[model samples]
Target: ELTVPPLFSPIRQAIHPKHADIDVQTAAWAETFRIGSEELRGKLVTQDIGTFSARILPEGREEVVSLLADFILWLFGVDDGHCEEGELGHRPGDLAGLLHRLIRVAQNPEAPMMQDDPLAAGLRDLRMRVDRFGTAGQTARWVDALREYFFSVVWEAAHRRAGTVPDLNDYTLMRLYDGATSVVLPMLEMGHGYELQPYERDRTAVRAVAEMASFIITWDNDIFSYHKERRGSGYYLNALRVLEQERGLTPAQALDAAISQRDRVMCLFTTVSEQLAEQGSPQLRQYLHSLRCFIRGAQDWGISSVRYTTPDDPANMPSVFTDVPTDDSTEPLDIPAVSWWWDLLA
Candidate 1:
């Protein structure tokens, strides 16, 4: 039996009052987008909390926020159905093909693909909505971020296929990409219609703080989702799993260590944000505020979402990962693609 620890973070909530409306609208649109499977639809509506998470950033107008909600629903569906211990989980080739087509949809919604899936079509619709309200630069950045996310998804698939657990360092670097923050965080600018100046975007302090914000949310998720994935996939990719397997800790011990890591990152975020707030541009400051909201929103959503907190029922839990082999490596593995994240701290 896994003993979970209390998750900690400094971020405070700013969820919008219209979160239910956002949730309802997102579920309705999932049907329109051909997310027709009852099990899938149920997960989208009952399990996912993308609407609540997106609602915290209230800069978007009602219609724009609705679009964000739909996009969030679509992303979660894709992550679960296409990536996580599902059809495309260990199949890097299939994931690559799907990602290629999805990126094409993001890049050119009007263009045709070799084969269209629900996710690709949903992305095409989202890209159209984004293009309608977002500036060219914002749309470009969103597309690039999506591409990076897709690439990282492939990275994860490759890792799973190799049957090797990544060390803490490589996992830390890769987690930022796999967490989908690059794609999700840019919605702040897209929804708000104010872009940070290039210099503001380029600041070391800005990137550091943004990364910390991502780390805090992503690590928090690792805790919330630990039980679900551990019971399913044996926690091969989880940070807590890496620590326990590599550092010789129990589940409870690993939980404490993960929370400590999250607190350290949160402290870094607070310190850097305090320094930047005094000298950052108006857009930078606004973006920072939204990031904090994003962090809090994720925490709130994780705690309450049925996706991570379902009762311990054998019937409710899918045994997709039971037969999958887990890697027991205790040393760090070299992953060149994500090695650059380590340098960001220097």
Candidate 2:
């Protein structure tokens, strides 16, 4: 087992009171989608993904929160079954072709294509729910975010094709998108029944905050999943591994560096969110609060989810987070794709 480091996070934790009910509903929804084979579905049941969604938006409407759970389960089906462990994972164009079709399904649920596909059926259900609960603007943004996620995965597929680890910069650039955190943002608004205005949501600093949330969640994902990914996957790519290869650091050194990078980003998230709350509208503050919940919820899920805990494999993850950041400097990360986050501070 790897020696896990203590995680640094100042974010508060909250969970939906109906998580137990949500979990049951989510399981049934997964069965409807037939997201994977019986065997795979059995395994997925252990993941408790519905609880994950509930935690992310604890006060969210129950129905919308349930919808988010089912959607997340479907995403895992694509990510795990098709993109990670399947043959298409290394076949870039093939993966792209399949994902583009699904994007259209999200765009037009009744599109006359892949009518018999289980994933398609599942997405159609999701699209209908989005129509029921989401505004036109939120629906469009959700689809766009989904397209962004697909594009990032295809990029990852290209790397898998070459059997190479991307440099830190390249991996960091796509990690934000491929993690699918951005795709969940619109749903945050939908669940709360309030749309963040373009003036606030589209602000330069607010966009930076959104990206920072993605960075922290995805980076922490890499850290938490590192053990299982290294021990089992056919090919592995993680921030720690990228740092290891790019800087020629040992495993422990890479772990430390990965934590430091995410810690600094978390520190910035705190600073910026507080500043935005003071000047922004009530809706903007709630959105920022949702981002915090998203990050913390992911942490709670990542550590407890069977997908990462790997009871059989034992990821040896930490059980708690600390308020003190490992590195709290307000300086920008050196990577070009994300360094601009610090510029918002000045």
Candidate 3:
């Protein structure tokens, strides 16, 4: 009904163009496409799953329509309650079983609260992901793909969050902006101040990374739940509850924080949507352009800045440490992407 020209993948758009480039735009674009080609090529080959499902989670009504359209495309042949696994045993129908299993493993009452066991704490956050996306059986399959796709989305978001990593270095550069670990816990710890149950020095790093994996996996379960359940109940609220309970916050306290949490996620998705819109892709084109001008100036990292600083500097000022080569290592923990960028660098 909403007739529109179909959009092609970034890879497809690169080889062909809507029009010939004016020599300057063409030259700039050739540089852009060369860089884009390498980035998309890596994204195509990488084990990362986030790129495939970037639009599945939407923060507002308008985005909801877009996400739903994408979901329908994702579930093209899926019949209700019937799962037929496709490649890698993944299909739109596998939603329920995956969710049931995820909850079984991650939501153990025996598991200690976030303040107690780091692994439990880590799993606790992941449990929230499962709950948010896949609280029910039907939601798991589509939710899983959505979450996996989001995991890939976060990789891109990580680039946006810490855009200092060059487009060429994107796959590798994400390691520097530790989402939950280096940045989150430190921020939370500072905000909450020293707790009676403080995270150990080692666990401060360990749990965040562990939870990163857990959150990504559990994200599969919960996002599927959203598609299956088709409502707000099957989204981020459950994960927030888990975070609250884990931290010994009162239900009221947790509920109060829900606004903050939701706001945080909304800001994140909107921010990321704006960020991805910038690159060579048409779909991503609007995304980068959607942000307001202040945000735009921020997103378009000048060549000089890329040479000196990482992009995640929220302060938006050039780093005092100019000329410091961005650290390209992944976190030194056991994440297995050796030649890849998961390993942390200084």
Q: Considering summed lDDT, which 10 consecutive residues are worst modelled in model 2?
A: 1-10
The best-first sequence of candidates by lDDT reads 2, 1, 3
Top lDDT hit? 2
Alpha carbon lDDT of residue 104, candidate 3?
40
lDDT of 1 by residue, 1-346 (tens): 5655445555554666576787787887898777635687776787545466554575565666777778777877777777774668688899898787778778887786734467767788898888887888878888888887788878888888787777787777778878888787667776677887768876766876777787778887887778777777431478888888778998878877776667656655665686777777888888888888788777767766777776653212221112111222222123353334334332
lDDT of 3 by residue, 10-64 (tens): 1110111111221123223223223223433232222111112111111212222
RMSD values for the candidates in order, in angstroms, are: 6.9, 1.0, 22.5
> How high is the lDDT of residue 260 in model 3?
35
Better lDDT candidate (1, 3): 1
Q: Deviation in angstroms for 256 in model 3?
A: 2.1
Clashes of 3: 28
Model 1 residue pairs with clashes: none
Worst 10 residues of 3 by lDDT: 7-16
lDDT of each: 0.71, 0.90, 0.27
State model 2's lDDT.
0.90
What's the distance in Å from true for residue 177, model 2? Answer: 0.4
- Evaluate model 3: give its TM-score: 0.22
